[PDB]
Amino acid sequence: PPGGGEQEPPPPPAPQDVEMKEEAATGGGSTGEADGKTAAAAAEHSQRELDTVTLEDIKEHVKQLEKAVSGKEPRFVLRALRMLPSTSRRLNHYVLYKAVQGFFTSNNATRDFLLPFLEEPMDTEADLQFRPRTGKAASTPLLPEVEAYLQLLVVIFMMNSKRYKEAQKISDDLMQKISTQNRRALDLVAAKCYYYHARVYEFLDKLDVVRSFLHARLRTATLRHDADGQATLLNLLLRNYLHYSLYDQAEKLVSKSVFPEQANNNEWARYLYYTGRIKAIQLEYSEARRTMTNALRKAPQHTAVGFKQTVHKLLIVVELLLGEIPDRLQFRQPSLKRSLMPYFLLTQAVRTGNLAKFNQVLDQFGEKFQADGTYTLIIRLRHNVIKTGVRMISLSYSRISLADIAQKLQLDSPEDAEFIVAKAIRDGVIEASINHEKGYVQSKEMIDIYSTREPQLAFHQRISFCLDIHNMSVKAMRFPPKSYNKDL
């Protein structure tokens, strides 16, 4: 006790310095930048903001700090408040109010003072001029810190935070349109908040209001938008449609649009994951495969270890349906391995194609993939084994034995053999020549490629498409140097 007591004060205020420096540099930097021209600078500090968010997501900050370290919560920005001119006395007050708590001690609390955070916005956020951007840059960064630890009856307080956020801005807006960089940031910020209380939404109750009105809030954005914020708001709706939708008659092919230019090095990956998950239900061999594989090969920036593992699971799961299943090769991480460990035996057992034994084997140790629910893709897979198997037969020789290969496939009968084979032929995924002479069915079964056979018409589309990609790549080495030479 005396040792821990004497060593008690230094550890807790570790992040304070670099955090104050962070908010001072970001806030003072951004405001001090766009102050002269707000409408000129566009999304220069955006990537910095999202980087700081993704960096502060893993924060270990509050652990033992639950006791009387919460004194930072009541205090706040307080930059040039209550008056536009004469900021010198307040420049002194910046040091003063920090010096007040630095004398001996200070009165602190946690759940005592919470709700009256709206006192200042009722009159002046900061300067009475820049209030929207200074106001959001004030409130929004510190809100997740207070709303941290969702459990332990913070749900009600989270609801208070909800209605407060709405009433101050989100309900409708502070004005018709901001039409500036703080708005372009407000898109992804409000979206991030939506993802933040999304957990609270899906926790117990359901959605009768907010995201349903988010459509009207979406079209309130004009069609002249870059649709970045529109797409981010589309992601939460699609994620809300992810678990249960089952109606493809509308949003599929209705939701399709001009698809403007968006990168962010995130939204591409996660949205392709979403629409890939949606389009994985009809088992698309051509598009979904390559686009989801590419999506897996994308987003190197933050973590491919804990994120891409799910889309990788889905990837190999929809891959083994074609009869040819590639495993993990180039990517080495101690996550996807353990995740694929129970599934490894069966996904390796796919190529073997044994119905009887593996029927019991799957259900035997099956846990997670049968915990996916409603046994859908697995009840498809069970009888997909014979289709991938007869596909392996299509990749096999021509002559079919009534005894040997019939015993190898564990199915012996004249009719169903040729019948199922014909069912494999009508698919159009293979090539076979149906002939009957002595009663035996042969096949040409030529898998030979387009080499030295109609070459022009063969690689035509390949040349056109690849040249288009390389040409837009030329555009990609064109426009950004101009973005470099714009200011010089």
């Binding site: 002559r399 040409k444 030979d448 490629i449 990609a476």
Partner: protein, 378 residues
């Protein structure tokens, strides 16, 4: 250590799993247990050994002998300490560390070799210490640890290759390349066999040849053989050691599977029951089979079942499923059709395919310039 006790303790693999060879193995294990302070290794391996009846007898003597020798080494160390000198403390700590390698204690050896590492006056002696970590590294079969000090001592040499130094290091490279499945890059390693001599520290010359004959015969194709071993007189000199190797080489070079499949059992039995060569016994077989098949199908297009069955001396039903698996899983040549009851290939892997070799790196480059486009603006 450089003592044969390293190999004796390396025989624990064949001493453990099989019950057939577990007689002579534990016999010369117990016989060599009284040499080079083998108490702790066979005490740890006692689970794979006999009961505690005859075990606890020698332990009382070995434990006091170890303590006496160790405290004598400490006495010599103290005699060397607080005195003017360089190589004295170096050799003292080195020998002490060697004894620490003899008892089988990795911690003491670690801190001792670390101390003498800090006491290294030159990079050569440092490399000697590195090798001293490598010889016990072969027993502990560590991977990154033994490559760490070698990668560290790789840079800043400037003294050039020595006689037995660069040679022994080359042998070590050959060994860690025996562990890993790297072949083509390791094909330059065994070219030093001319200057190699008998080594009782790690592996014997004939054992080294016996180990490298696998990668040389399998991983290297006929032009490589003619360029290296056939042109060289080394294999010509060492073929007189055993009649088996010469037959294995001649049968493969003359493409005769008749005697090859007959002597294949000996090759399989010799392949397994090895320390570092154990996990790869599955790979070399398949690789040699697909290499032989590719070699035979290289100069042959349309092959009848009769001549093939007479050549391999094996049933058609087995090579049926064999080739059937080598189509999809093997990925060697084009589709084979049984409609004529005669094997007939096409293999348009030359003309259009030579230009189609760059489509993979082209697609990868497409994804990579998509990455380059991904770096844009953020």
């Amino acid at each position: 250590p450089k003592n044969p006790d390293l190999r004796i303790a390396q025989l624990r693999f064949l001493l453990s799993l099989p019950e057939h060879r577990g007689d002579a193995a534990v016999r010369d294990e117990l016989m060599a247990a009284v040499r080079d302070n083998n108490m702790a290794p066979y005490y740890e391996a006692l689970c794979k050994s006999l009961d505690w009846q005859i075990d606890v007898d020698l332990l009382n003597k070995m434990k006091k002998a170890n303590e006496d020798e160790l405290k004598r080494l400490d006495e010599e160390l103290e005699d060397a300490e607080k005195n003017l000198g360089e190589s004295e403390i170096r050799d003292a700590m080195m020998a002490k560390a060697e004894y620490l390698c003899r008892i089988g204690d990795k911690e003491g050896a670690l801190t001792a070799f670390r101390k003498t590492y800090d006491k290294t006056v030159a990079l050569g002696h440092r490399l000697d210490i590195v090798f001293y970590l490598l010889r016990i590294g072969l027993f502990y079969m560590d991977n990154d640890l033994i490559t760490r000090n070698t990668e560290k001592a790789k840079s800043l040499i400037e003294e050039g290759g020595d006689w037995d130094r660069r040679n022994r290091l080359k042998v070590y490279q050959g060994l860690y390349c025996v562990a890993i499945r790297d072949f083509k890059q390791a094909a330059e390693l065994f070219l030093d066999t001319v200057s190699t001599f008998t080594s009782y520290e790690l592996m014997d010359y004939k054992t080294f040849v016996t180990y490298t004959v696998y990668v040389s015969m399998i991983a290297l194709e006929r032009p490589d053989l003619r360029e290296k071993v056939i042109k060289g007189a080394e294999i010509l000199e060492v073929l007189h050691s055993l009649p088996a190797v010469r037959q294995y080489l001649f049968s493969l070079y003359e493409c005769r599977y008749s005697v090859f499949f007959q002597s294949l059992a000996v090759v399989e039995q010799e392949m397994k029951k090895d320390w570092l060569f154990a996990p790869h016994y599955r790979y070399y077989v398949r690789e040699m089979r697909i290499h032989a098949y590719s070699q035979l199908l290289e100069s042959y297009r349309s092959l009848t079942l009769g001549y093939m069955a007479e050549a391999f001396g094996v049933g058609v039903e087995f090579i049926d499923q064999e080739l059937s698996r080598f189509i999809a899983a093997g990925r060697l040549h084009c589709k084979i059709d049984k409609v004529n009851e005669i094997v007939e290939t096409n293999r348009p892997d030359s003309k259009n395919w030579q230009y189609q070799e760059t489509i993979k790196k082209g697609d990868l480059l497409l994804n990579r310039v998509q990455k380059l486009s991904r770096v844009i603006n953020m």
